[PDB]
Amino acid sequence: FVLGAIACGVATAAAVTAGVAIAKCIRLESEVTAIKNCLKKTNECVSTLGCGVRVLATAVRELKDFVSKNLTRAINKNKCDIPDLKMAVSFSQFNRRFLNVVRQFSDNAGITPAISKDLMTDAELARAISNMPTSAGQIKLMLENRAMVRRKGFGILIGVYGSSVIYMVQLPIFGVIDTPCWIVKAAPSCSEKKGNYACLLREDQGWYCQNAGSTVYYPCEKDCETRGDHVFCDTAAGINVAEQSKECNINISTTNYPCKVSCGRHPISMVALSPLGALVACYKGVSCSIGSNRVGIIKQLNKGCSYITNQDADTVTIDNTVYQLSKVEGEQHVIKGRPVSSSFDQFNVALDQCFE
Amino acid sequence: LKESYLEESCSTITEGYLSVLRTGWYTNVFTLEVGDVENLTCADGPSLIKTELDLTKSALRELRTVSADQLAREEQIENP
Ligand SMILES: *[C@@H]1O[C@H](CO)[C@@H](O)[C@H](O)[C@H]1NC(C)=O
Ligand SMILES: *[C@@H]1O[C@H](CO)[C@@H](O)[C@H](O)[C@H]1NC(C)=O
């Protein structure tokens, strides 16, 4: 098969599948009541469910306490047009989290896209991060990146049990930090002669992380997201690769590794936005240009592959698609070399098979 | 960061990143206690407390049916 064409969406499905399986376990009567019995004398609990999963359990009781200790005795005789303005305002402040939790679970059919402040306050987010099975460096990093923790976690509704709204939040455990990581991008390199094209494309684009003496490859670049120098990666769709495979980044023709490529005669014009610039594959049938936001269009690009740094131009356009170049600054190298395409329909094969 | 454009393969490699790898999931279970709200009623017409109470009872009843819907959708997540 072709790895880049199948890998996206996989890590997402694994997260949902993992969460739903945990949710199924929590919905049993024995586990709901165990959790409910853990939280009888305290607001926070840690416990192992019958299925083996460790959960932190948190009771949120402000609304119930307002309803028991203020609202009920104030609405004796079933009258609510009472001249108690602080009661009405307190009621409105105390029930807003609940109403927000209902809206987020109702709009999303029981599974939220992120961890809102109504599923989890900053205080509660910090409490759960503190309880994670990892060391101080990771917890310190996670507490300094709560926005990323919220963005990679999600909630699942367990159910309504009496007056008790039970739900679970999956938080990402970032257990391995600060190992070396790099991203590979590619676009079709294609030679032209007799109206005929001879194309080459690398089939190992994505993120690579050297973790524990072993290199891991994340084919779906959307499973990784950058904040500054840090790259946040889901490891669910990760795949080990040999150490020698990094040689495809200096010598695609090496004999130490069969570098994966696709070679064909059907060029596809595209723009590959990279961190510090852009790759631009421009061929007959579409037009490509770069521009600055102050002085309009800079120049039309020649056909073929052009590397535009994010300082050479602020925008690159292919046909009517407009891409914003990054604003980051960094070391930019052009490693010069004869395009292998100019030495010439297979897919995801070793490069020596493209020559025959 | 260091970005290297490979002219021999129309590809780039950008180096210098430090990893933050999600190796697991930590489960936080929440019980949000609403209180005995459904045994309360306002019999004296429009009112701020009546409006807030009807939002709360309405939100409770809606989440019950949202939960039921979820049980069919969880079948499809596991048994498509
Ligand atoms: C509710 O009543 C308790 C005592 O029964 C009191 O301490 C608290 O301030 C009251 N809350 C409000 C919002 O009036
Ligand atoms: C790349 O590797 C091949 C075979 O391993 C070799 O023939 C070629 O000279 C190498 N090129 C460079 C620049 O190392």
Author numbering:
A (entry chain F): 103 to 446, 454 to 465
B (entry chain B): 19 to 98
Q: What does the primary publication say about this deposited structure?
A:
The human metapneumovirus (hMPV) fusion (F) protein is essential for viral entry and is a key target of neutralizing antibodies and vaccine development. As a class I viral fusion glycoprotein, hMPV F is first translated as a single polypeptide precursor (F0). Proteolytic cleavage converts F0 into disulfide-linked F2 and F1 subunits. Three F2/F1 heterodimers then associate into a metastable prefusion trimer that constitutes the active form of the protein.
Furthermore, we introduced an E453Q substitution to MM-4H to generate our best construct, named DS-CavEs2. The affinity of MPE8 Fab to DSx2 and DS-CavEs2 is similar to that of the hMPV F base construct, although it is much weaker than the affinity to RSV F DS-Cav1. Taken together, DS-CavEs2 enhances expression by 10-fold and exhibits high thermostability (Tm 71.8 °C), indicating its potential for vaccine development. Next, we determined the crystal structure of our best construct, DS-CavEs2, to a resolution of 2.5 Å from a crystal in space group P21. There are two F protomers in the asymmetric unit, and DS-CavEs2 also crystallized as a monomer rather than a trimer. Unambiguous electron density was observed for all disulfide bond substitutions (Cys127/Cys153, Cys140/Cys147, Cys110/Cys322, Cys365/Cys463) and the cavity-filling substitution (Ile231). Although the electron density for the charge-balance designs L219K and E453Q was also interpretable, we could not validate the formation of the inter-protomer salt-bridge or the reduced charge repulsion at the trimer interface. Similar to the DSx2 structure, the two disulfide-bond substitutions at site V did not alter the local conformation. In contrast, the Cys365/Cys463 substitution pulled the α10 helix away from the central 3-fold axis and thus altered the downward trajectory of the HRB. We were unable to obtain structures of trimeric hMPV F by crystallography, so we performed negative stain electron microscopy (nsEM) analysis on MPE8 complexed to DS-CavEs2. After 2D class averaging, multiple classes showed DS-CavEs2 as a well-folded prefusion trimer bound by two or three MPE8 Fabs (~70% of the particles), demonstrating that DS-CavEs2 can adopt a trimeric conformation.
